[PDB]
């Protein structure tokens, strides 16, 4: 990664074993549940493209997903080159493949990230990777929201947990609550809780619905 | 987070893997037991709004609770905007890190004078966590009754653990909760506690039923 | 905590996850055995009142003990206010509730701890907490020294271990050896070892008693 | 390794116990799966030849592979000496850290201009690791065939894992491997994949057989 | 402990959680095996008396041993006071950290010239630990005899482990312990060891009975 | 150990608990397999003689090996004194027992290691220790290369692994491949693989032999 030392200047540091092992274990434990994306963003903080490739390449399984991620990176790369056609001791401009760390050296990557003004090739590449991870998370979501239905003896809290977890994966995003998803939550509740939720009438908050079906 | 380096100057650092893993494991182990709030406050020390969103977003389960937390944040956001018509002034959505950049967040937190958007957002999150802790509290204090063979210490432990979760708070001891602790004790210990008379300390009650 | 940076000046640092997890695990493993107090003193080194409250508040069980600790803190607080009745840019004097971190901000706590001269509100509060932990350790000591008696086939070393562990908890303190506890150690030994210990005569050291009952 | 301290100057540090243990555990867990190469490149960042030899020498098993690695290093060493007749110039055996001191290695790596003997040696080691990864690849891509009840995603996972090991490389997707992926699919999924027509993306194939 | 920061100046730091946990775990795992003394010396490096008391006080079991240790410390304290009638001079109880403040301890350890009260107290503690190690040594060297089917290496391991604990020390090899090692060997290996003749090295004895 | 601080000057640091625990665990796991030597060299980097004695003394078992190591150290010590017979504020010259940290203080050891010019007593002692560890590794090698023979159903890769692991321990060294060890590898292969290896003819590489017996 690129960080400020105690002298306050930008400098390259080797990716830490702790950071790398945390990412490898995140992928092993969480697969492509939607929470893997925020973990990726946190652990890749300050990353060079070289660091980002290290993080993706150290993954041993999920090679179908890693090939889907490469298609997305190549698409984002081509789009960058399309919208960016092309002084002594200054950097050549970065191509798509330079941002993805394929055709760029570490020295060039750090050069761009510490140039005046900076070209944050690390942050641009991280954005492309997250677009690919979002796509994988939606593809791998195992159950449609249409089939998330409260079991006849499933507590309402456990049903609401499954419901909002499914919406988060299908949208690769937690901005999923609104008047219409409230209606779907009620539609897919079991007969007992459904009858109770309808009697609350319109505009019932999640707190009030969860309280009303708790007994 | 924003911290003082060894040169003593305020600067942004990446959230540490250790800190992130500690929070994720706290939530996995402790669910929404009341002690998760002090753990949240400790592990979010010096946090930017961006760091606070990282900590909440890395939680994979409890998505019902995460939506309750968002409603509370949005309420606190609207209230901030209502009471507040080099840096542009922050809106509610800037404090919650939705419409603000890292650069803006660090700008505000290191401005003269500082606008601690990190500490303001942490306050809103704790309000939401308190609400979740009370919602998830499984047992009313009314149902905490000493078993016929339960040591008094084990009953007092269950009693004050229940008050803490029901009130998302440990300022639960007073003359009336003392009365309820006595009321719900088993006949043997209840008879002993009454004979102490009024105003008995917790030490004296726990000594007398030991 | 408050520490000296490499420039040698006093500054606040966030409590470390390692420190917090060590305290939480100390309490989970050691309950209120007397060794929890020295662990508390070591892990709370440089602590602000805010840090000390973090350490106590992160404990999930033992809420009977945590309420006993609060009674003791409130007593120490009232006593401070009793014995301390009440320039531009200097600190207001601390009340009991400011030392316990209830009515004081972090900024005020660090202010006091780095004032000329310093008011060590962290060290004053730690003292109050240790008085509360001492009281809990004595209350929770499960066996009176009167009932620590060598089993008929218990090795003498194991009996002496139980004896001095009990004295440490009942006094919340390891200054427990003297001519009279030597006499009690002999009184409560099994008939075989008791007969051997009496024949040593007066003034026998612990080494000599432990050697004499080893066979 | 040779790194910049907080004063921003290049200096030698002892290899860290954490780094060494991470590499030893990577080799124990992952054997010569292709992902061991990127782990090697990450954990050897800033390495001197001395550090690289430490990392290879601390491996206790796989001594057949360690001798294959040495043959490759000796080949790269001879090739360097062939193409290269304050610091004396480095020989192949100086880059591999056999005939060079730490002082010489750090000298070269911090010279104006620098001779990155660490990065040159790491390149030779990766060439050797690639060779081992292909030798140890247990299954030909020709034998990766979708089971009659195997989900397509699990078959695609096995297919691209096999190409990666057979080629010690993840640049394995192209029009002809797409054709082989279809050829080796089960009858049901094969019939679906053919009806998509030519040029179907991996996303579209994986969606269609889901 | 008192250490040099990166500015190269002597300053007090809080004992680290890692160091404390390492010592507590050393005592839990190794009891009073002789190797606990070198572990104590390593983990107490730069310790103030306050730090040394923290390390001893955090031990929860072995309270018989902890009282033996205190008798030895009090003996060394009295002896110091006997031979020693800006900083006031330290008494025995000041070196053991009973009657001295942290400020005084750091004062002495950073005085010109320094009075290393930390190193003096560590010496007294090691004297006490040596005494405990010998008391707890479970087997006399006289009872270490090679089994009829015990490999010689396993017998030599038990022999030198026993001498180390009996003497709280690894300077145990000499012409007379060589003679005892031979005397207590099994008949087969004893006959072989005698035929080597006098002055045989440990290498040659271990080779001959292999 | 002795290291450069961020001011770039040589200074003593306490041995780290992590470093010590890594060495103790290396010895517990790897015994005296030949890879323990490179682990010893890595973990003892920058060590004073005092640090090196800490590392050896913290080992609880293997006391036969620790006495063999002491014989070798004493031999290297005597040899140093033989080949080194003997200004204000400069260091006395080191004896063998000063390099081994027996008759030298930490202050003297750091003095020598930071003298102009330096006497690297740490690196000299580490060399003596490695000579002792090499000797132990050869002594403890459990099987002669003469008895490493491919099992009738042992895969060739597993046989070659055992073969080169044995040569490494018997030479305490991995410079073990050459035309004659190639001949011994063939001699000791099972009849099936032996017949295949002979038909390759002379000069066959290890890659070609391992490929030819893989089926």
Residue numbers in the entry:
A (entry chain A), C (entry chain A), F (entry chain A): 1 to 86, 92 to 220
B (entry chain B), D (entry chain B), E (entry chain B): 1 to 85, 95 to 219
What's in the article?
The coloured tree for CA position 50 stood out because the amino acid at this position defines the pandemic lineage, with HIV-1(M) and its chimpanzee parent (SIVcpzPtt) uniquely harbouring glutamine (Q). In HIV-1(M), residue Q50 contributes to the tetrahedral hydrogen bonding network that promotes the ‘closed’ BHP position. This arrangement is also conserved in our parental SIVcpzPtt capsid structure, with SIVcpzPtt Q50 contributing to the ‘closed’ BHP position by coordinating a water molecule. Given that HIV-1 CA Q50Y was defective, we returned to Chromaclade45 seeking additional lineage-specific changes that occurred along with capsid Y50Q in SIVcpzPtt. This revealed a patch of differences around CA position 120, identifying a deletion of arginine CA 120 in HIV-1(M) and its SIVcpzPtt parent. Inspection of hexamer structures from non-pandemic viruses revealed that the Arg lost from SIVcpzPtt/HIV-1(M) forms a salt bridge between helix 6 and the CypA binding loop in HIV-1(O) and HIV-2 CA helix 6 (Arg 120-Glu 98 in HIV-1(O), Arg 118-Glu 96 in HIV-2). This salt bridge is also conserved in the SIVmac hexamer (Arg 117-Glu 95), but not in the SIVcpzPtt structure. Thus, an HIV-1(M) CA mutant bearing Q50Y + R120, representing non-pandemic HIV lineages, behaved like HIV-1(O) and HIV-2, activating innate immune gene expression in a TRIM5-, cGAS- and TREX1-sensitive way. These observations outline how key amino acid adaptations in the HIV-1(M) parent SIVcpzPtt led to structural changes in the capsid that reduce activation of, and restriction by, key lentiviral sensors, cGAS and TRIM5.
HIV capsid has a pivotal role in regulating viral DNA synthesis and shielding viral DNA from cytosolic sensors. Previously reported X-ray structures of HIV-1(M) CA hexamers showed two distinct conformations with respect to a channel at the 6-fold symmetry axis. The beta hairpin structure (BHP) above the channel can assume ‘open’ (His12 forms a salt bridge with Asp51) or ‘closed positions’ (with a bridging water molecule between His12 and Asp51). Inside the channel, 6 positively charged arginines (R18) are hypothesized to mediate electrostatic nucleotide recruitment to fuel encapsidated DNA synthesis.
